[PDB]
Write a protein that holds these residues in place. Structure first.
Motif, PDB file in Angstrom:
ATOM      1  N   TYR A 273       0.837  -1.173   0.000  1.00 49.96           N
ATOM      2  CA  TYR A 273       0.000   0.000   0.000  1.00 49.96           C
ATOM      3  C   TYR A 273       0.873   1.223   0.000  1.00 49.96           C
ATOM      4  O   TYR A 273       0.480   2.274  -0.514  1.00 49.96           O
ATOM      5  CB  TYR A 273      -0.944   0.004   1.189  1.00 49.96           C
ATOM      6  CG  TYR A 273      -2.260  -0.554   0.778  1.00 49.96           C
ATOM      7  CD1 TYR A 273      -2.410  -1.913   0.584  1.00 49.96           C
ATOM      8  CD2 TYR A 273      -3.325   0.285   0.465  1.00 49.96           C
ATOM      9  CE1 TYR A 273      -3.579  -2.433   0.085  1.00 49.96           C
ATOM     10  CE2 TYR A 273      -4.510  -0.225  -0.043  1.00 49.96           C
ATOM     11  CZ  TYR A 273      -4.626  -1.589  -0.230  1.00 49.96           C
ATOM     12  OH  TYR A 273      -5.781  -2.129  -0.734  1.00 49.96           O
ATOM     13  N   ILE A 280      -5.663   2.821  -6.775  1.00 51.21           N
ATOM     14  CA  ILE A 280      -6.733   2.002  -6.233  1.00 51.21           C
ATOM     15  C   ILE A 280      -6.826   0.711  -7.034  1.00 51.21           C
ATOM     16  O   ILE A 280      -7.227   0.708  -8.193  1.00 51.21           O
ATOM     17  CB  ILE A 280      -8.073   2.789  -6.238  1.00 51.21           C
ATOM     18  CG1 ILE A 280      -8.055   3.823  -5.109  1.00 51.21           C
ATOM     19  CG2 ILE A 280      -9.236   1.870  -6.048  1.00 51.21           C
ATOM     20  CD1 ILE A 280      -9.290   3.790  -4.230  1.00 51.21           C
ATOM     21  N   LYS A 282      -8.453  -2.588  -8.081  1.00 48.85           N
ATOM     22  CA  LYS A 282      -9.756  -3.252  -8.100  1.00 48.85           C
ATOM     23  C   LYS A 282      -9.599  -4.748  -7.863  1.00 48.85           C
ATOM     24  O   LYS A 282     -10.531  -5.414  -7.425  1.00 48.85           O
ATOM     25  CB  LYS A 282     -10.480  -3.007  -9.428  1.00 48.85           C
ATOM     26  CG  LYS A 282     -10.805  -1.536  -9.666  1.00 48.85           C
ATOM     27  CD  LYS A 282     -12.090  -1.337 -10.480  1.00 48.85           C
ATOM     28  CE  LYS A 282     -11.930  -1.681 -11.972  1.00 48.85           C
ATOM     29  NZ  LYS A 282     -11.094  -0.705 -12.743  1.00 48.85           N
ATOM     30  N   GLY A 305     -12.572  -0.118  -5.873  1.00 47.47           N
ATOM     31  CA  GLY A 305     -11.220  -0.170  -5.358  1.00 47.47           C
ATOM     32  C   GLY A 305     -11.100  -0.912  -4.036  1.00 47.47           C
ATOM     33  O   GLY A 305     -12.091  -1.173  -3.363  1.00 47.47           O
ATOM     34  N   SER A 307      -9.940  -0.938  -0.235  1.00 47.92           N
ATOM     35  CA  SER A 307      -9.531  -0.166   0.932  1.00 47.92           C
ATOM     36  C   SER A 307      -8.577  -1.078   1.683  1.00 47.92           C
ATOM     37  O   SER A 307      -8.757  -2.299   1.673  1.00 47.92           O
ATOM     38  CB  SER A 307     -10.726   0.157   1.831  1.00 47.92           C
ATOM     39  OG  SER A 307     -11.049  -0.946   2.676  1.00 47.92           O
TER      40      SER A 307
END
Ligand SMILES: Cc1cn([C@H]2C[C@H](O)[C@@H](COP(=O)(O)OP(=O)(O)OP(=O)(O)O)O2)c(=O)[nH]c1=O
Ligand SMILES: [Mg+2]
Ligand SMILES: [Mg+2]
Ligand SMILES: [Mg+2]
Length: 341
Positions: A273, A280, A282, A305, A307
């Motif tokens: 990340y 983002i 998917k 996306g 999180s």
DNA sequence: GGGGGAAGGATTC
DNA sequence: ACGGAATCCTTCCCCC
């Protein structure tokens, strides 16, 4: 169309030499220690002093210390080699806004404008070559020829800190001379199937039946090798974009227990990340290396996306289905993130 | 038949 | 001894 390709030489290794010239002269092995046992892990890359003896990447560090026991052993530091690359790459764009960044040590140009004729290309060579050599202190090989492919072979046959051009007349002498394994896109696994069909030199790819290719090397490859054989090939340089990110940590010790793994899977997400910064994904996958070094991943695409929370939630859902559909233990465990929005 | 994808394994580097 | 990052290829499926 004229292509001036560039390969940063023993990049990782070299960077470190620029970050402490005391090395430039000595053997240098950059490597990712797995942490299990003292000196466990693997070589990431070695300069010509260390390579000129058998030390190359992929080989165990221990085997390395065995050949060159007095070499400098430095852990790898991607970030740094990543910026020393960008500082250089941007330093190439001011030579064409249409450049193609293949790797971290590769860029593709098309000075068809800037330089028509070859001897004229051969100079834009020592001038891009001499400059990156004076700004970042890096030395790079230059390759010149008709397409992107013969541009690699160009830099390939003349690297490091070398230069070479392949007149269109030569893109014809090598079609029948050049082995098939030294052909960009050809790795051992493929250089064999091909030898099994009989092929060796480029040109030989027309002899054998086309459906004889397709089945043995896929059709993308087939059309690919067929093309270059006819001097046709000719493909456009393309800016290109990374379309996936991921980290793959190393287990202190093999683990099949979903909790000894967990702490690793999460170091992998964070360390993805962060590298993902502002992207983002998917889709998400989980890669896990089976002890007897076999790979087996899992994935899942979402209609939106991911999180970082979803990233752990489903992350754990995939590892489990592996620990389930398989039974080997796990040496390596990571996470891939793809299909950005 | 095949387009539109999704997935897992394969191969390159 | 046997890291690491990405993408390439073949396959399965859904519903037109
Ligand atoms: C062939 C191979 C390469 N690699 C890494 C090590 C090589 O340094 C790199 C491929 O480099 P190459 O591009 O083949 O040669 P290079 O000098 O241009 O690369 P570098 O500037 O980094 O030295 O890929 C592996 O990790 N495993 C492998 O099997
Ligand atoms: Mg390189
Ligand atoms: Mg490289
Ligand atoms: Mg090859």
């Amino acid at each position: 169309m004229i292509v001036l390709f560039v390969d940063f030489d023993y990049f990782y290794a070299q960077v470190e030499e620029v970050l402490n010239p005391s090395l430039k002269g000595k053997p240098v092995v950059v490597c990712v220690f797995s942490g299990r046992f003292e000196d466990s892990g693997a070589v990431a890359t070695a300069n010509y002093e260390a390579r000129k003896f058998g030390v190359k990447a992929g080989i165990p560090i221990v085997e390395a210390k065995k050949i060159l026991p007095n070499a400098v052993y430095l852990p790898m530091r991607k970030e740094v080699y990543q910026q020393v690359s960008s500082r250089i790459m941007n330093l190439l764009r001011e030579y064409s806004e249409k450049i193609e960044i293949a790797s971290i040590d590769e860029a593709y140009l098309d000075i068809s404008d800037k330089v028509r004729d070859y001897r004229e290309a051969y100079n834009l060579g020592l001038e891009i070559k001499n400059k990156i050599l004076e700004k970042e202190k890096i030395t790079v090989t230059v390759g010149i020829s008709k397409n992107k492919v013969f541009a690699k072979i160009a830099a390939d046959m003349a690297k490091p800190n070398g230069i070479k051009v392949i007149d269109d007349e030569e893109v014809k002498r090598l079609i029948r001379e050049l082995d098939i394994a030294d052909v960009p896109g050809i790795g051992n696994i493929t250089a064999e199937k091909l030898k099994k069909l009989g092929i060796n030199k480029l040109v030989d790819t027309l002899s054998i039946e086309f459906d004889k290719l397709k089945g043995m090397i896929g059709e993308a490859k087939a059309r690919y090798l067929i093309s270059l054989a006819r001097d046709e090939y000719n493909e456009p340089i393309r800016t290109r974009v990374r379309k996936s990110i991921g980290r793959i940590v190393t287990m202190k010790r093999n683990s099949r227990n979903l909790e000894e793994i967990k702490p690793y899977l999460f170091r992998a997400i964070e360390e993805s990340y962060y590298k993902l910064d502002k992207r983002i994904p998917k889709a998400i996958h989980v890669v896990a290396v089976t002890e007897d070094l076999d790979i087996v991943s899992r994935g899942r695409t979402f209609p939106h996306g991911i999180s970082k929370e979803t990233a752990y939630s489903e992350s754990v859902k995939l590892l489990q289905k592996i620990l389930e559909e398989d039974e080997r233990k796990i040496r390596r465990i990571g996470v891939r993130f793809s299909k950005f929005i």
